[PDB]
Design an enzyme around this catalytic site. Sequence first.
Site, mmCIF file in Angstrom:
data_model
loop_
_atom_site.group_PDB
_atom_site.id
_atom_site.type_symbol
_atom_site.label_atom_id
_atom_site.label_comp_id
_atom_site.label_asym_id
_atom_site.label_seq_id
_atom_site.Cartn_x
_atom_site.Cartn_y
_atom_site.Cartn_z
ATOM 1 N N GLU A 169 0.819 -1.213 0.000
ATOM 2 C CA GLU A 169 0.000 0.000 0.000
ATOM 3 C C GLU A 169 0.850 1.259 0.000
ATOM 4 O O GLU A 169 0.511 2.234 -0.673
ATOM 5 C CB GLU A 169 -1.010 0.009 1.156
ATOM 6 C CG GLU A 169 -2.058 -1.134 1.096
ATOM 7 C CD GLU A 169 -2.778 -1.244 -0.244
ATOM 8 O OE1 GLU A 169 -2.979 -0.218 -0.931
ATOM 9 O OE2 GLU A 169 -3.157 -2.369 -0.617
ATOM 10 N N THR A 229 27.036 -4.916 -6.639
ATOM 11 C CA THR A 229 28.072 -5.946 -6.676
ATOM 12 C C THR A 229 28.228 -6.588 -5.297
ATOM 13 O O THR A 229 28.607 -5.913 -4.324
ATOM 14 C CB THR A 229 29.470 -5.397 -7.122
ATOM 15 O OG1 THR A 229 29.365 -4.784 -8.407
ATOM 16 C CG2 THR A 229 30.490 -6.529 -7.210
ATOM 17 N N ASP A 263 25.592 -27.478 -2.683
ATOM 18 C CA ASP A 263 25.299 -26.185 -3.293
ATOM 19 C C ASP A 263 25.981 -25.908 -4.597
ATOM 20 O O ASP A 263 26.976 -26.543 -4.933
ATOM 21 C CB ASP A 263 25.729 -25.078 -2.338
ATOM 22 C CG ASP A 263 25.278 -25.323 -0.928
ATOM 23 O OD1 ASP A 263 24.105 -25.692 -0.727
ATOM 24 O OD2 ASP A 263 26.091 -25.138 -0.006
ATOM 25 N N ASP A 277 29.707 -29.634 -3.179
ATOM 26 C CA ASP A 277 29.444 -28.366 -3.833
ATOM 27 C C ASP A 277 30.127 -28.163 -5.171
ATOM 28 O O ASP A 277 31.117 -28.815 -5.489
ATOM 29 C CB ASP A 277 29.835 -27.237 -2.872
ATOM 30 C CG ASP A 277 29.253 -27.420 -1.492
ATOM 31 O OD1 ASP A 277 28.014 -27.420 -1.337
ATOM 32 O OD2 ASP A 277 30.036 -27.548 -0.537
ATOM 33 N N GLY A 286 38.127 -12.224 -12.487
ATOM 34 C CA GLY A 286 38.779 -11.746 -11.277
ATOM 35 C C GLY A 286 39.623 -12.796 -10.573
ATOM 36 O O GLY A 286 39.627 -13.967 -10.958
ATOM 37 N N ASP A 327 39.827 -15.040 -7.679
ATOM 38 C CA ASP A 327 38.936 -15.611 -6.677
ATOM 39 C C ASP A 327 39.623 -16.517 -5.689
ATOM 40 O O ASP A 327 40.695 -17.052 -5.972
ATOM 41 C CB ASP A 327 37.814 -16.384 -7.369
ATOM 42 C CG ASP A 327 37.054 -15.525 -8.320
ATOM 43 O OD1 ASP A 327 36.615 -14.449 -7.914
ATOM 44 O OD2 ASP A 327 36.938 -15.894 -9.488
HETATM 45 CA CA LIG Z 1 38.435 -15.946 -11.366
HETATM 46 CA CA LIG Z 2 31.864 -28.899 0.404
HETATM 47 CA CA LIG Z 3 27.548 -26.891 1.030
HETATM 48 CA CA LIG Z 4 34.979 -13.762 -9.656
HETATM 49 CA CA LIG Z 5 29.964 -4.640 -2.880
HETATM 50 ZN ZN LIG Z 6 -2.613 -2.797 -4.625
#
Ligand SMILES: [Ca+2]
Ligand SMILES: [Ca+2]
Ligand SMILES: [Ca+2]
Ligand SMILES: [Ca+2]
Ligand SMILES: [Ca+2]
Ligand SMILES: [Zn+2]
EC number: 3.4.24.40
Length: 468
Positions: free
Chosen positions: A174, A324, A335, A353, A360, A362
Amino acid sequence: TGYDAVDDLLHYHERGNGIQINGKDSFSNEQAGLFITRENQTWNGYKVFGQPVKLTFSFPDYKFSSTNVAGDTGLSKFSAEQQQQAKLSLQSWADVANITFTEVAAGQKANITFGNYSQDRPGHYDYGTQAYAFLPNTIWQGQDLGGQTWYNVNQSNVKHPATEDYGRQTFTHEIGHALGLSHPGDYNAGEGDPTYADVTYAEDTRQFSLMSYWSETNTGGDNGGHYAAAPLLDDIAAIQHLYGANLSTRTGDTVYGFNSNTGRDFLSTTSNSQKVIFAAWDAGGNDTFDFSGYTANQRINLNEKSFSDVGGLKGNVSIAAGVTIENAIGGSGNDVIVGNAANNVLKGGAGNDVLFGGGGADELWGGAGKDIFVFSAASDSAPGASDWIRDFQKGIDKIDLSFFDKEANSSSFIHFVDHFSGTAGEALLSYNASSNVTDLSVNIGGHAAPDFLVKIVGQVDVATDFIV
Ligand SMILES: [Ca+2]
Ligand SMILES: [Ca+2]
Ligand SMILES: [Ca+2]
Ligand SMILES: [Ca+2]
Ligand SMILES: [Ca+2]
Ligand SMILES: [Zn+2]
Ligand SMILES: [Ca+2]
Ligand SMILES: [Ca+2]
């Protein structure tokens, strides 16, 4: 393969660009923001976009026997619980756009007001409506109705917004109208019977916007019976279109999810049972999506405008355009964690995982379990900005380079050698037993020198540790 899982997450909920979903056109985040604000009304004026705004609000003390502009009666002032939750909803809008809210006394005229109603006519209680509000510059008998929001206190969620999440979402919705937002499509209930089939664009669901009334399941989301408390992905685009993006929000190093320092209820959780649903707006700093306390299998994408499956829900977490987020921590489930072009610290935690750093330099941690580290471009780990795999266990973890041979459609492109010669596809493992570091160099581009180099803490067994 690990790459298949990454590719899958990267193409999750693609939109716009001539896509058609559910037999409906797909609008990009940008188009949806424009359509949601199709009335062109703002507190700054008709068609005045991108300017900041300062607004006052209050909780008037309405008389029960009074009738409001809409004809409803049995009026009352917001309770303490209602006021507390309304203030949290206001702040959630102020976090994303250049809007300043200031509370004025019950008697003072305010831009935005909150009030409860209970009867559609004297002596007759209404159990069929929920709430309504007027967009700015709504003129009636020479009086502006804009900013007025009304709620049916006979509904338990309206009466108890602190415990019923649909109530809190209603307040945010709302207030959205009071700021200039419309529902994402035209359709009238009561004197009409609309359904998701009557939407203008596919993304008109609660997965993308809380201005929508259609279930997130219509687009493949699943919030597990919960309702988002704050502006979602397309709401952010809409409101920033009207009042500009708030560049002062959470400019420090911010942690979202577990161990949060946000000071926001909808961005924080303290247990596996407490589920998060949010679209993240963050104006600066080194940030982390900490979902370490969840046991479900999660899918975390750190790319802007992308969706993640977090805490057992589906497509419940997203990142706004222009934001970012740098780091991600998975939970005990299996995962899939996909980084972005920035330097990312990705941690899989327990479980099997799949980690993908992208561009970049990492820092990758598989944690316990059989983990897979995925690469698909020389720029993923360029010499001079190399990725580091900090906890590789030979015979347990794996390095997935399958992308290259698939693209080359050749089983011999990527192949290990004991010495370079300039041929493209040559891969070389160099193990330093004194430092416990293994260098993986690959000459993907076929240059004089390798254009891909990953530094690994631990020993790597070429016979068992690669997917090629
Ligand atoms: Ca990388
Ligand atoms: Ca793991
Ligand atoms: Ca995990
Ligand atoms: Ca990266
Ligand atoms: Ca950031
Ligand atoms: Zn509404
Ligand atoms: Ca931040
Ligand atoms: Ca591992």
